[PDB]
Ligand SMILES: CSC[C@H]1O[C@@H](n2cnc3c(N)ncnc32)[C@H](O)[C@@H]1O
Ligand SMILES: CSC[C@H]1O[C@@H](n2cnc3c(N)ncnc32)[C@H](O)[C@@H]1O
Ligand SMILES: [Cl-]
């Protein structure tokens with residue numbers, strides 16, 4: 001068999017299209033408040049789950065995937081807010097690096113985003129990111145590669161957008177990527193974080209998020225499936 | 232044998248006294264960027280580790296303790312900032328409930344601290360908290376029981392203190408308790424979060440934190456050991 005693959009979203013809406021697109025029989029397995037969908041696709045075991053929103057939920061679920069299910073790589077798929085003009089609604093990006101943008105130990109003179117015995121930026125798989133870019137090029141679709149900023153707040157203001165761009169040079173904002181990628185690094189598991197834009201993280205981001213959740217989630221899911229087809 | 236006990240701190244300084252106080256032989260076992268210290272004490276297996284600071288670190292470590300080591304209860308020991316006049320430097324409290332004070336999905340009209348498919352407050356073990364209070368009473372020391380607010384920022388301002396008190400009626404602030412307790416709840420593992428005050432979470436909190444880390448960490452550790460002696 002091929003290498004077992006964990007596939008993660010944050011919300012049920014992000015994994016519904018994934019389950020449908022793979023089209024195989026899934027066994028549901030409950031663990032730690034999550035439901036894991038276990039199946040076989042192209043001679044690979046795939047484990048699919050949504051974590052629920054935010055850093056704690058996604059850290060927990062990723063750790064479970066690795067420790068309880070023994071996944072050998074993790075692909076994350078979902079929606080995000082754009083911080084750059086060139087990332088429009090529905091556009092895709094993969095995270096070259098991620099940061100926890102809400103971490104603040106500045107009282108001890110640490111840079112924002114930094115925690116002792118850790119680092120500001122978290123790395124992802126160069127191999128998976130390069131695969132993503134090749135697939136995008138062949139499909140003739142755009143694919144940005146940049147920094148994704150993750151925190152436990154839904155960002156919907158110009159001020160916070162300006163901070164994320166100025167402090168971290170982030171291209172997009174969401175609430176799970178950094179934690180998923182962090183856990184994968186700690187366990188030596190290759191990770192790719194893929195996001196489709198559904199809003200511009202500004203004052204109207206809530207309405208845009210609602211309008212485009214279904215389409216953006218499907219866009220990311222379809223692309224994730226195209227990556228698995230090449231693995 | 233008795234029930235296996237996980238013992239957690241956030242920083243090395245918080246677990247050093249724990250290891251010394253138990254005084255038994257520990258085997259060091261690395262996993263996921265953490266070092267777990269495994270030993271036997273009063274016919275109980277104890278697993279001791281520091282998570283590193285913050286929600287992601289502590290979520291990861293707690294999940295590892297439960298999934299990889301199969302602990303049957305988790306006791307957390309460490310230092311915190313006071314939000315109430317009656318909690319002075321060195322004073323102890325146990326968390327009756329915890330909240331993630333930096334969670335903000337208000338763009339979707341959710342209450343602060345709330346995430347869909349979750350809850351604002353996380354519960355802890357009534358049994359362990361009651362044990363703590365009995366021990367405190369017998370030792371003739373004060374022990375507060377209240378809400379602990381956890382977030383990924385070191386709090387050092389009157390404005391943020393006022394928010395924590397007004398929004399959550401929190402008694403103390405720290406950066407790991409809510410995540411540890413959250414993971415324990417998801418896995419059905421009893422949890423007690425114990426903290427000793429080392430600062431007042433105000434403009435001078437950084438200096439106070441440094442001055443009292445050693446003493447406050449030891450105060451919490453000694454009390455945690457006294458609980459284990461009754462288990
Ligand atoms: C309902 S909370 C937003 C959910 O969508 C993602 N997301 C999309 N746009 C944004 C944004 N503007 N700010 C934060 N997270 C975002 C986050 O990862 C989370 O799972
Ligand atoms: C060095 S970051 C502070 C460490 O001590 C705890 N802590 C103590 N006082 C405070 C405070 N004022 N604000 C946040 N965390 C605190 C947090 O849980 C963390 O592990
Ligand atoms: Cl905002």
Ligand SMILES: [Cl-]
Pocket residue numbers: 385386387388391
């Ligand atoms: Cl503050």
